[PDB]
Design a protein around this ligand. Structure first.
Ligand SMILES: Nc1ncnc2c1ncn2[C@@H]1O[C@H](COP(=O)(O)OP(=O)(O)O)[C@@H](O)[C@H]1O
Ligand SMILES: Nc1ncnc2c1ncn2[C@@H]1O[C@H](COP(=O)(O)OP(=O)(O)O)[C@@H](O)[C@H]1O
Ligand code: VO4
Ligand code: VO4
Lengths: 556, 556
């Protein structure tokens, strides 16, 4: 049973706030004892024969106990509520950090939309788990644990009945658990299929709309829903049977305790009222012993998502060394490849047996057939994945002996797909040099021909853009990416298709500025348009992961 | 109070399944009456003086009533559980349909990731609302409604006390409601800000990682979380105060009922036991009257998301006319523009005063400066938004008098950003002609040079691709999009930057096949590379939403 594992992990995640956790535990123990003490007082006061309640009597003890009860209820309802939200925010922040720090392959293979779903439906489940646990469960657990001795002290037969009730509850839970586990695995798989289909279609609404396949897609979703609820029903059937069994056990226990109280007619003590006290005990227990069962149901679902949330956390194998790592500094520019080879997981293709050198001050232009291993070479330079066999040598330092923070600080890149945030243009250019100035932002925009179109439209620089920069067409996105890269001003520069959506005039106007600014550094340009590489100092072309010439600018 | 509105809307959404809803209501009424009848039996049987329970006695009535109670509990726990999931799936399917059918501007301005979040957190809230409502609330509402007459019949003073309890609960709920509403609006706004930031960053992990700003982004998220929980606390404070007040009212009502039962010592009837019966009443009520209050808390949050889910549903203003619309058929190809103008909402730019004509059998190539209103013209042709002033004329038919299904069936397009589904390549090509054959799929792949690279890699055609086609670089995505468009074979063809990521050789090899296949139809090509428009029959260029020449292929 992973219930113990996930509960202990939730406790470990909750143990950071000691100062409040111990207080919550103490208050829970106190309120459990109050809820245990109330029924005994009720049995003592329910005599109603010659009690004379309105003068002192156990009714004053009632008043004091109820006042303490309401005060403790207020304290718990405030403290647990205030703790749960703060701790959920903390867990979300730490998990978001660990999620961002993960490499790109893990994101591409799984994430984009599934990762955020995992985050949200794990943190919300953990929050509800913490809140319900604290209040109801941390009352009831210690409440029953302290109750069973008191039940043993007077009228041990009733304590035996209560023990039988507890054993029956445990047995029925365990019996239901196997079938529910078997069903819930398939249920979770089917739900994942349904959600991934929904996300895939919604994220690509333009294509599904522009091809008249809305009806087909909704029919596919209906089929997925039918598949999901086809295997869903047995789980609900078994849970309902469990509810029936525990309710029947509760009814039988009530019958037993009433009959035993009646049979004690021979032992005519004051228990004429105290029996009612025991009744409350059972009542109390039964009510609480129901609240856990449905609770268990919740976690039997939650497990699924929680498991992923832990499989991510245990996957914190990223370690750039605490201090043994030597952050590379004072970059001059010297790129050397040593027999670099890469095989994609469960696939072919990838660069094979490449070795070339780059001297400082000169630019390198990779051309050739499409899909021939250019983007993979470029992102091998930035080390988004470690080459399987071979070395990448930077100015007398191996790349695998360099901190990630230092390596990517000296490499400024424009990707093939210019990614953008939906913030303002000012912020989208500020993600270069962090806090240089506004004048340099203006200059960088001017250099990449980004100032001309933006100085006279839509509230100036403080202009919002839509998701993935959907409000600036395609070419303007390329201009903003180029301006950002130029503003970062790193010794190593990369431009993967910098002129994918620019006409000839803007292409020339941008490339001349890029050359003027980058002549002091080393840059790579990946393009099929040979016009932009007229100033290239090392022109090379590679076909299907294999070099051909790797010669100078002018060669045949 | 929108509580009545949203509850009535949930009921209307639940009224489709009449055959099961009426059964659930009947069972709820029955179990409410059973829960009302039990305490009276308890008061009658708790005498324990000369009852002689083990021979007949009210204990047999206990046994029968408890058996009916457990049977009804099983029936409700099965029926409500089976109903809720099926109805949630139905609501999700219908809302997904309405979401897909909405226009592109609404998606771009808001959706991609927020729309799916709205869907999921609205449907899950509705599901939990339905389940909790049915079981607990549709028991307790009619239970109390039928209880208050019985309380009035015997010992009207206790009924008065119960009425006072109910009035106090209503008053404290209403008092808490104003402050909770004021807080929850700001809380929801802040949560939306936090989630949009998280989604924006996660969806763009490559850029945030490649610029060493993970620390800055997590600090921004921490600041957002601090802002969210800064205004969160007063809501929890007020809710805890409400819990304290209702618990105090419950305790006072218990004191009142016990004291009144004691004062009835003068009226020495059998009520010596029946008073205990009333106690259970109060007990019952109090417990149930607590379950609603926290329930209300839930919906006070849920409202926010639910409101959006209704604002979407009420926004079903899309109507292509049921039958008055005339689906355009037998397309020959004749595109005419009539003074078409467009102003973007709260922005400048857009095509101004355009009018041109297209004859069948000839192709039209739009060139010119970047960001000059080309993509907007093309998507005006497909009518993703209605021109503000002007007409689009297709073969003697106005476009606004044409069904959307018929119009986009005759126009096959490759977008500037070639969108792809993460299904196999076979499925990504099957979204053209729906069920033509496999041989024509192979031929279409061969024509667009997509067969050569794929015949010998990664399990053939049945090759999965990642999210947004991340597993095929960029150029292969363009080839797949071109192959899809060619396979659809529509009389009107559009190619927005069909050679954005192809070298010269593949560009020629693809454009010759495209020309050979499309010479029988009319096509538009939007490109800054003049090589692909060597066969263009109508070359025109437009600058900042204004035409210049609109001449033939050869002009100066
Ligand atoms: N995540 C991946 N999984 C499998 N194959 C991949 C993946 N990424 C790239 N490839 C393969 O690597 C080849 C080259 O990719 P890439 O370098 O991105 O394109 P280009 O060669 O045009 O720069 C492609 O043919 C593609 O099939
Ligand atoms: N959703 C939008 N909101 C505001 N402005 C837009 C939007 N979409 C496009 N524009 C403006 O319209 C102009 C032309 O856009 P578009 O036609 O997509 O590019 P192109 O002219 O290169 O085809 C751009 O300069 C852009 O500023
Ligand atoms: O629609 V473009 O920005 O490729 O001219
Ligand atoms: O598919 V490419 O990386 O040659 O633009």
């Amino acid at each position: 049973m992973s219930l113990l594992k996930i509960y202990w992990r939730a406790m470990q995640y909750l143990a950071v706030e000691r100062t409040a956790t111990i207080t919550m535990c103490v208050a829970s123990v106190l309120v459990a004892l109050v809820t245990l003490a109330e029924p005994v007082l009720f049995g003592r006061v329910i005599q109603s024969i010659s009690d004379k309640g309105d003068i002192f009597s156990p009714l004053l003890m009632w008043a004091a106990l109820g006042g303490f009860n309401i005060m403790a209820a207020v304290f718990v309802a405030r403290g647990a509520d205030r703790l749960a939200h703060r701790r959920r925010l903390g867990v979300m922040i730490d998990s978001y950090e660990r999620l961002i720090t993960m490499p790109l392959a893990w994101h591409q293979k799984r994430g984009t939309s599934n990762a955020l779903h995992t985050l949200i439906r794990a943190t919300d489940s953990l929050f509800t788990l913490w809140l319900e646990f604290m209040r109801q469960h941390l009352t009831t657990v210690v409440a029953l644990a302290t109750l069973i001795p008191v039940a043993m002290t007077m009228d041990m037969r009733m304590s035996l009945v209560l023990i039988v009730l507890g054993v029956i509850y445990v047995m029925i839970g365990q019996l239901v658990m196997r079938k529910t586990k078997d069903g819930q695995a398939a249920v979770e798989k089917h739900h994942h299929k349904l959600f991934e289909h929904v996300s895939d279609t919604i994220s690509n609404v333009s294509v599904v709309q522009s091809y008249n396949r809305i009806a087909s897609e909704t029919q596919a979703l209906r089929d997925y829903a039918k598949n999901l609820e086809n295997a869903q029903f047995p789980v609900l059937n078994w849970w309902a049977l469990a509810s029936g069994l525990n309710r029947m056990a509760s009814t039988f226990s009530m019958v037993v305790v009433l009959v035993l109280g009646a049979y004690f007619v021979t032992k005519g003590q004051m228990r004429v009222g105290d029996v009612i006290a025991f009744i409350g005990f059972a009542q109390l227990m039964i009510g609480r012993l129901d609240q856990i069962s449905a609770f268990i149901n919740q976690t039997v679902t939650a497990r699924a998502k929680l498991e992923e949330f832990f499989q991510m956390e245990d996957a914190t194998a990223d370690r750039q060394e605490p201090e043994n790592v030597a952050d590379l500094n004072d970059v001059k520019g010297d790129i050397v490849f040593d027999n670099v080879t890469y095989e994609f997981p469960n696939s072919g293709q990838g660069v094979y047996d490449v070795s070339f050198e780059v001297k400082p001050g000169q630019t390198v232009a990779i051309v050739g057939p499409t899909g021939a291993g250019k983007t993979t070479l470029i992102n091998l330079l930035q080390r988004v994945f470690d080459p399987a066999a071979g070395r990448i040598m930077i100015d007398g330092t191996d790349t695998r002996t360099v901190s990630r923070r230092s390596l990517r600080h000296a490499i400024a890149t424009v990707f093939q797909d210019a990614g953008l945030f939906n913030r303002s243009v000012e912020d989208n250019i500020r993600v270069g040099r962090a806090n240089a100035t506004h004048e340099e932002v203006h200059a960088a925009a001017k250099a990449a021909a980004a100032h001309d179109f933006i100085l006279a439209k839509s509230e100036g620089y403080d202009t919002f853009v839509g998701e993935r920069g959907s409000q600036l067409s395609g070419g303007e996105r390329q201009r903003l990416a180029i301006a950002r890269a130029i503003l970062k001003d790193s010794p190593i520069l990369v431009l993967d298709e910098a002129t994918s959506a620019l006409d000839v005039e803007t292409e020339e106007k941008v490339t001349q500025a890029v050359d003027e600014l980058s002549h002091n550094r080393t840059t790579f340009i990946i393009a099929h348009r040979l016009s932009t590489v007229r100033s290239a100092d090392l022109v090379l072309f590679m076909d299907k992961g294999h070099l051909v010439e790797s010669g100078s600018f002018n060669e045949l």
